[PDB]
Amino acid sequence: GSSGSSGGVRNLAQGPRGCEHYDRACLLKAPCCDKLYTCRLCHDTNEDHQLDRFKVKEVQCINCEKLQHAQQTCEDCSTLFGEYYCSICHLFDKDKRQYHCESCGICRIGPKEDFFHCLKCNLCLTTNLRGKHKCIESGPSSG
Ligand SMILES: [Zn+2]
Ligand SMILES: [Zn+2]
Ligand SMILES: [Zn+2]
Numbered sequence: 001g002s003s004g005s006s007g008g009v010r011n012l013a014q015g016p017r018g019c020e021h022y023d024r025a026c027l028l029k030a031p032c033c034d035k036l037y038t039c040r041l042c043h044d045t046n047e048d049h050q051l052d053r054f055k056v057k058e059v060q061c062i063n064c065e066k067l068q069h070a071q072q073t074c075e076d077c078s079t080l081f082g083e084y085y086c087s088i089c090h091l092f093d094k095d096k097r098q099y100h101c102e103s104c105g106i107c108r109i110g111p112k113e114d115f116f117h118c119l120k121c122n123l124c125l126t127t128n129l130r131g132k133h134k135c136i137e138s139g140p141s142s143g
């Protein structure tokens with residue numbers, strides 16, 4: 001002779017349609033576990049192993065869940081998977097003042113104007129460090 005009440009509320013989360021990492025509309029297949037995650041960073045985040053960003057080439061759409069290969073736009077809904085589409089890194093991110101470095105072969109965040117790439121060092125460096133940073137090592141006395 002007693003009436004109870006139902007409980008156990010729940011919440012929601014955001015994943016696809018562009019994650020905190022990047023803004024894309026297509027999940028990249030995982031040739032490691034045959035799974036699909038917003039971005040490469042997400043995979044590892046929801047997995048014990050790390051996924052590659054170069055190996056995988058195929059991609060799936062989130063607008064019309066249509067299958068397709070590495071591209072910038074869909075072939076069924078023509079939904080921009082990202083203003084910027086890389087072929088080497090196979091990454092798709094919205095216009096976030098980012099540029100792809102050839103010397104490194106990886107995507108980087110600009111604005112390129114306030115940035116540059118050193119040879120001797122073989123890496124990207126911000127203008128703020130134009131000279132201050134060292135490239136070659138030298139000096140007998142240590143400490
Ligand atoms: Zn995996
Ligand atoms: Zn992500
Ligand atoms: Zn689509």
Ligand SMILES: [Zn+2]
Pocket residue numbers: 086087088089090091100101105106107108
């Ligand atoms: Zn790239």
Ligand SMILES: [Zn+2]
Pocket residue numbers: 101102103104105117118122123124125
């Ligand atoms: Zn670079």
Ligand SMILES: [Zn+2]
Pocket residue numbers: 118119120121122133134135
């Ligand atoms: Zn240097």
